[PDB]
Design a protein around this ligand. Sequence first.
Ligand code: ZN
Lengths: 220, 598, 329, 608
Amino acid sequence: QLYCDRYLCDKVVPGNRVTIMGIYSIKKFGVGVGIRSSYIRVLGIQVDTVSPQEEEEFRRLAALPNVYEVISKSIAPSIFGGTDMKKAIACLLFGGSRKRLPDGLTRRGDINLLMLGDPGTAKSQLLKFVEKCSPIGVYTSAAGLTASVMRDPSSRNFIMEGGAMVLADGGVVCIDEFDKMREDDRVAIHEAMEQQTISIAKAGITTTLNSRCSVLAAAN
Amino acid sequence: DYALEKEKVKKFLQEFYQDDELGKKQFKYGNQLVRLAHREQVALYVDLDDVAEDDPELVDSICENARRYAKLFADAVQELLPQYKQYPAELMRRFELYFQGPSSNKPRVIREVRADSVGKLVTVRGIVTRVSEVKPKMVVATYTCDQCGAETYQPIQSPTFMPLIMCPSQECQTNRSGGRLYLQTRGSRFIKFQEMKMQEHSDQVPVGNIPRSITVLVEGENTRIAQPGDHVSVTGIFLPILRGLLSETYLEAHRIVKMNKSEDDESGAGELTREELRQIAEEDFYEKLAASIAPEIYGHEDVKKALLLLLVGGVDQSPRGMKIRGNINICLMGDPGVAKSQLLSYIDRLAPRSQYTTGRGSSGVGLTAAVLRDSVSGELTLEGGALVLADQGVCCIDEFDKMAEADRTAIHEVMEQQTISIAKAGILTTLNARCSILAAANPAYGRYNPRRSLEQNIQLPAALLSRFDLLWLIQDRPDRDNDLRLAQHITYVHQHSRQPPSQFEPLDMKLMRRYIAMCREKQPMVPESLADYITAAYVEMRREAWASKDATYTSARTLLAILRLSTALARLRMVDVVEKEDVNEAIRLMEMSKDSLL
Amino acid sequence: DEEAEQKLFSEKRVELLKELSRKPDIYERLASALAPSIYEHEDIKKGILLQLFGGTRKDFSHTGRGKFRAEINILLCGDPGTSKSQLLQYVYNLVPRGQYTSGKGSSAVGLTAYVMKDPETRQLVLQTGALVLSDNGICCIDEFDKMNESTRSVLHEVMEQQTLSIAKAGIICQLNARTSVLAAANPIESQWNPKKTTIENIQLPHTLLSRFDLIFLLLDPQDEAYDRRLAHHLVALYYQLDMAVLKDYIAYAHSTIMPRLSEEASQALIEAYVDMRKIGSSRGMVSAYPRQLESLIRLAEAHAKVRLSNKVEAIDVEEAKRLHREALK
Amino acid sequence: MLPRSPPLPRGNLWELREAQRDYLDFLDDEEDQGIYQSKVRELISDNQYRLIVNVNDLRRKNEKRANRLLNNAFEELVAFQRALKDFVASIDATYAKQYEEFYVGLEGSFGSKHVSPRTLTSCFLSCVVCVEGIVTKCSLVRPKVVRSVHYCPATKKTIERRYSDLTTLVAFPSSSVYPTKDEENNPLETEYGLSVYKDHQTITIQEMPEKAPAGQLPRSVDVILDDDLVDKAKPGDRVQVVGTYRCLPGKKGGYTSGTFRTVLIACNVKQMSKDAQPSFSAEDIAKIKKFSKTRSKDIFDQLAKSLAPSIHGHDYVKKAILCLLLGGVERDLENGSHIRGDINILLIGDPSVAKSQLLRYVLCTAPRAIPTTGRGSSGVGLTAAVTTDQETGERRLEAGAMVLADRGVVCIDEFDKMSDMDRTAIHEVMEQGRVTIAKAGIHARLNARCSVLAAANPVYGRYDQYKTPMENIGLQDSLLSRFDLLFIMLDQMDPEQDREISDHVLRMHRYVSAAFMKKYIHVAKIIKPVLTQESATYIAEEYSRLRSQDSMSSDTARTSPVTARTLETLIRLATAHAKARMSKTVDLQDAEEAVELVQYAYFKKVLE
Ligand SMILES: [Zn+2]
């Protein structure tokens, strides 16, 4: 357990790699008779990992005559055959544009894809690739995909669990075995791709979560 | 200051006139003080409209404080009592004083009473819940020093109190510097006490908000007035609880009035006048009421004739120790849109004790009685269902074909023996549930069809079909003429918001609810000379339903219909013996209930 | 609790009982005094009267056999309106230490024994159901058909061995009781259609029909004479033998009687079982297993107790054989 | 987008003596334009405690004080509220004593103080801030003493006592001992009627979802409403609290942990979203009374054409949806009966016929509309469910969807993916208008007078145009009677309509008045026309001709049964058509406008 201070607060996010320099010490708020608690008072922190000239290697590449295939060729090195199934995936990484008519009746800005066919493990590779090479992306087979309402042991009441499609903001979500997902969960993912938001009205929960992600599904 | 108020209240208590006593100007409180002095009465409901008749200022400063004043009054009467006819002046009180709300104030709701009215006289309306049982609350604890042979007292105010171990008499201490004194439950004084919660009417709540509760400390004479699950109106101070700066509050009831009838409990005021005996003595009194039941509904001249027998009910015997029920059960199988859920909603409001339930929104343990645990004590307690809360009244269950099949056999017990026998793992008992049931249902798949016979476009097991004395069967026959008159009725209704002028104007609900309560307690008999007529009729039935291809399951439980469906009629005509003219009315009913199929 | 109190009978009363027990029909004179509101139904009252005495309480601890049930289980099947539930409602109000149960409002563990988290000590403790609270008396189970086959297969133990073996989380024990079921059911389709076979209107298995020993089929149609007599009787209840004879005759006949078989009675009990097999085999009505041969004993002895005969003779087998035969017809 | 003012700045047109003597001079306000002397009086005529101030004015008047007030809020707001009682006594001293103490809210534009609960650091301690966000709980309103009044029955005197806690602007912890014997000689007795209590709540603002960085669990903050600000916020809102920020310490056993808890002592609240339209101009009402008079022939059709221009075809459905948006007239007879005054519409058809579009438009047009689906909705979660509390542990009745939307609209899409055990929970709340619940420890009846707009995909995936209208719909003839209008919008296969539909949507993908229907229907809703015997004999005839099968046709099937329940839907559509005209008397031209709709919606034709 750590203890950050004035300017070290809000410097790291759950999921980071760090390197702490702290003063290993003991709590003094005064199993065993003389046992104490212990923490590390942090007083140094680190994190482990755009340009004008970099802009030009995007410019010229967008301008070169055969700009289309150069990407769709280098987005699936291992798996080969039928570049259409790789042609399409090139678009999902960019997507259309979000329009707001005068009525505020916004429009989608993402796409969805289904790769039907036998599970022959040729598609899991592709899922892993598209997840790895994405600005935001999650590959799922826990809490679920959409939100749930679960009876908390402590509260003894129902609480709300936003799943994956609420954490992926603009990103891309990959799914396999489209008949394995929980019946309720499959209903909710249907509605989420329909409306692009999840709104549960149950025991003590009436909230809304904007789902803004891209579905790349693989069937069987 | 108050020393001059104790005189301005004595004046009012000794001087007040009243004319409505039916005599001359007597003294409303003049007689009361004598009765109280002769220990023939305990409570003195000092009205506040009468102080607001000659001094509208004192009323302003009562409902402003109402805590000092309720003590000045109990001192004024304490002084006046001897003048008509132990050590502390409270152990010898033996009476209490209560304020009956002033008429100018308006009955608030539970949500409205805020902190700006702590310590003032308020008035709330609500539904009772979780009324406790009477327990003795101490007022003046009496101790004794067994050593020095004395008697001592101390008065209690808080919900707690610390006893005494002194014997503070300086003589006992001075002589010997030693001695303890025992508590004692003889010389002390207790007073009845019970606490009960109130909730808002779920009607007068914002569209989806949670109702709030309040606590009421009934004590003294107002106890045992209110029953749980009840509409009530309470008048009492609104105080905080003793023992940081936040405070929890309770209502300290001074007056409790039942408002079941939507106006004020007038069941005890069910007095029929001679000018109404005029009507009740007419030739066809039975036929006026029948037409004055839910007049907004055209047609159905016969169904309204049976829904009245259900409200009056037959007589119940007990020969050689073999109980026979004296209630009537009725079902209303029929096509969609024939105003069944209107008839039921009306028969709900025309009954002293009634309940409304829907088949698809009620579970089988929630109808009869449920055993539920308290996570505060871990103790299992019983909790009545619908049929228990509707003990001496009527229960209404529409959408009766859609109730789950394991939640419907929990009615077979209440329809014949009229008890509920629970043997779950906390309790083992039989509650009394003497209710008469009235249910509505759709025949097969929404609509009757003439291909399949009965019993297959009804879908009730014979064991339950036979529990119903009258399974009435209506239809949506689209006869061009029958539709024209129905429409010319409903459009008149939507124009004027009333029914078209009928032969006889319907009686008020308030008046029928009394005409019937007077008509229940007759208990007519049966004459022997009729046992040959009745018999033959019954026999004939067992022939037809045995020599037919549609008829239902008739059994020896049908005879008791004819019998108990005629002691109802003979109870309307105010006779004290069943006559051969009512047996034929009953027999006609049991025939006009399945003719809608021929 | 009043077995010591039976010695507290006026000797003026034992004369009365012993003398009433000599009239040639004291059987039909006591039986016909049960429930003086049902119509004739002459046999069902005979069965329900023999159930209030029960066979002897023999002591089989020596033969290592175990124990031996001495009470009689009775089943009533028949089409609606035939006054079954009234007989249960009457018995339940007569016998002390009894219960009344129903079909859907009773579970598997609520009838025999459940395990509850005791609130204070937070520990699992055992409790007793309905078939164990009766324990000396009758456990009326109405609506016998409408209990899913799970909760119906529980009666197999408590109604034949008079025991109950529990093995749950921390409780491993073996109760016992001396109850006697009295059940009432409806035929399947709730209508006794005579096209099907008797073992098809009941629709109960054989491993459950054999634990009963008096299956009364109330086959009653629209007999124009019966209906007329019944209606004439029922209407009479609207105008307007003793008990303490029966209430004391029963205590006596329990306290100081123990019918032991004979050799002339035992020689009519062997053939009465060798014919039952050939009869019940073909018809397809209800087969007969050796358990019935014990029931006859149970019935025969129970008849001898009615007349205080203290010894089972021939006629006490012919009666309780005609009763066992003329109930399924 | 940054909210740098409570009044949306884009389209607003359409010692301690110096402070106290400067606030008074600011509150004079007479000599320049009399802005506040027009507000003090205004509130005295309404009997209010507090008045809202614009700091934007304090700036122009005196910059130094405007800065010293946003950085030392406590010592400045204890001097503002003093020199406000001073200035109200300078108008009506009789009023200036009715109330114990006055209060003063704030509003305007604070420079860097407009923060979110995520940015509210510990450099804003004792500084006016303006927090925005969602309320996600409330507390139980409880009194709280600020003064006692005691009494000596022996000495006939009267002593008082002033209370103060850590939730004041002065912050001295007083003990609530309630003295019973000041001097050991005399006994005391409290007088509750003459004491002074106040209200007290505690809500929890939480950061807006679409403003979170989405990686964490958005931050929260605790607000302490008071003194008739109390019930001004329910769970699920979007508020802009404007209150001082404060840390309140503690000590359990003479040894304090340095850790403190920080709260926000609110002194104003603002609902950000405008969810009402009663603000109309006299020019607007003039326009309205013009338009309602111009042509009585064609105002309904002209209204409905302009309903949803973003959709091509479906004129009938738009007509009926307008009828929904108006509503009938709820008659309650004298004996206590009640007849509903709403219209429930059902739309079935092949995929992609703009059903969801019509629903999503009816949502935004009408006020108080609630959306719902066919799988994210249980039979009990629609009406009311029993639960308990976490603080008290005693049961209560949480309101479902169709009880929140009272006097409103409920939009149920994919009404067919709802199990049979779930539709049945509606038959009471769609006709009788109120929900009845008898659960274990709950017996209640909630008012749910609403109207249902539902959309359902047909069985077989697509509407087989040959079977029959009854086999393409799974609903049983008991639920099919509740919904009084059934529109079969099967995918328009005719080649013409698709052409203009494509034109329209593609034009949209290359980027009567709209904001006038709002006011016009919000006005024409209240009118309550009354039948007349000229038409009431025409309806009473068209129904008796509908009810006769022969007069219908051959080779024509029935979508839904005609009962005595469609009769009073004729009456409802009629008096909802004479609500657009603002007519107040239905005529024979109405009872004929609403009969063709029925003739079209009830009977379908089968092919082979
Ligand atoms: Zn003493």
